[model samples]
Target: MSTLADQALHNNNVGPIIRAGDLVEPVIETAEIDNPGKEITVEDRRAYVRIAAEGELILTRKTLEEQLGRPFNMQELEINLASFAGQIQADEDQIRFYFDKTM
Candidate 1:
């Protein structure tokens, strides 16, 4: 049986969804996401993790650094970012994943 959220994902016609796969467990544990409507999901695959949201997802480096308890850079995430399924915009402070119909 599938949950409502699972059904919503498959029947999605609202907008573009975002997904990130193959992220290190440490990063997945430390990263913070801005998910309104409680639409974000995190899957732990033992060796790595996957994060997904229905629309936009954002993670700030400042929050990640706080959880890590050490100096951290946004660039470090690239190493573990094996794949993604949305438009990605990353900078020194934050990373955003979304989809734009104009694209």
Candidate 2:
């Protein structure tokens, strides 16, 4: 969090910074399933791709498993968890992002 990437951001904005590579491509493809519509802002910066959203985000373990074709586990997601925004909570069934934990 010492770099500009870790600077302040919108409370309603939440997402992940995935390392730019082949796995990242799959991340975006699977991420699209949950936070596809809306701005779903995707900024590619060569080194990495910033996948984010405005007041949105959702992750289903089932979808996490089925969507990946490789049947990925929740722990596997962090393999590319280079960095992320917002408060995240992962349960046995799903992963939720809190835009504003104080709410």
Candidate 3:
């Protein structure tokens, strides 16, 4: 069953969904997300994992490195990124996801 938040998100297409495989679970799990609204959903599918937010989402290398307990590079995430919904803006320090149209 879907929660109210899930219904809301699906109904409106209100945010970005970031998904990556198990190899980079730590990166997505610990990465900072800006303005994640009332909830952030994490799903494990054995082969891959998904992280989603109800609005704009951000992931920073600093946080990932901290969580990974070692030096980390933003580019490393690309290897495990199975899929994502929304436009992506990325750089050395961070990655952001958002819809091109107003949400």
Candidate 4:
């Protein structure tokens, strides 16, 4: 049997990285914005987000759905954003389509 690291290597799971030009938006509610640092800011009728997820940033709606065991709604996206703060960021391109495991 393959170990976890071995499996990851076999799958070419090199993961993702955050770059300077990446766009970000918060999924959290306005009421939960207390203690938000420099990365968060209010803009024209919406909040701007700049946090990144830890480890590998899974940037896909289908991945979020599988992790959430349901559809990828706004609330789930907020939770994912909150949990992965300072390590990853999700954008429009990330959630534009459904994900398939075999792909």
Candidate 5:
């Protein structure tokens, strides 16, 4: 698990930066966004947004601000991601099974 400090930097719009194993951690929650037909997994949720590529961090502050019509600080964004990750973690078994079946 990443420390709060690490998560703090992530939230502040400081990165679409790559982290371990070429994963680009998001600073915001994206899990709530529906991916109806896509096979999303627990491991996928744990990393960050499900990107088109492994190292791609899809959401950025500018993008989010544009979408929401409000500015968001890094801390807020980080918290959102944390919440989403927690939601996914809470459903870990289901997600894992779903992914396993798909694979």
Candidate 6:
């Protein structure tokens, strides 16, 4: 048996594994803003708040600042994302997480 498959690696889901703090709430809501659907869900590991979804998760800095009630910067988000699932792509305007999908 493939251990990666046992880890549910085929699902293609990804998101930020953020430390528990004020940062957690907005990032969770940000995913809802960009991808509002059944695709997204959360897990609480006491010290971490995890927001994850299938295939892709996009976070717009513009949208997040509204929730944060301050100016935004991807760097502000990056530090907490020290841990996460799948692959990540960062741009001036947004942060993206992606992975493979299969039946």
Task: For residues 41-86, write the lDDT of model 6, one tens digit per residue.
Answer: 8998879988898878888999889877889897788767758786
Per-model CA lDDT versus the true structure: 0.57, 0.67, 0.61, 0.32, 0.31, 0.81
Cα error of candidate 3 at position 85, Å:
1.5
The estimated TM-scores of all candidates read 0.63, 0.70, 0.68, 0.26, 0.28, 0.84
Alpha-carbon shift of residue 34 in model 6 (angstroms): 1.0
Residue pairs in steric clash, candidate 2?
A: none
Question: Which 10 residues in a row give candidate 2 its minimum summed lDDT?
Answer: 2-11
Per-residue alpha-carbon lDDT of model 1 for 1-103, expressed as tens digits? 5788676555312211222333353455443333445365566565545666655666678876776577889888776666655678989997777666522
Best by TM-score: 6
Comparing candidate 4 with candidate 5, which one achieves the higher lDDT?
A: 4
Top model number, lDDT: 6
Question: Can you give the lDDT of residue 38 in candidate 4?
Answer: 17
The positional error of residue 78 in candidate 6, measured at the CA in angstroms, is 1.9
By lDDT, the better pick of 2 and 3 is 2
lDDT of candidate 2 over 5-97, digit per residue (tens): 445542367677888655576666656787657566678988888777665566666776765567666776777768776678887766665
What is the lDDT, from 0 to 100, of the residue 3 in candidate 6? 84
Q: Which model, 4 or 6, shows the larger TM-score? A: 6
- Model 2 error, position 85 (Å): 1.2
Q: Which residue pairs in candidate 1 have backbone atoms (N, alpha carbon, C) closer than 3 angstroms, thus clashing?
A: none
Q: On residues 1-103, what C-alpha lDDT tens digit does candidate 4 reach at each position?
A: 5688666544311122112221222222221232234132223322333332212233455443444355565334543332222223446435211122221
Q: How do the residues 6-78 of candidate 3 rate in per-residue lDDT, one tens digit apiece?
A: 6655531222233543445564565334443436566767566666665456777787777668877899877
Residue-level lDDT for 13 in candidate 5: 18
For model 2 the local lDDT of residue 79 reads 72
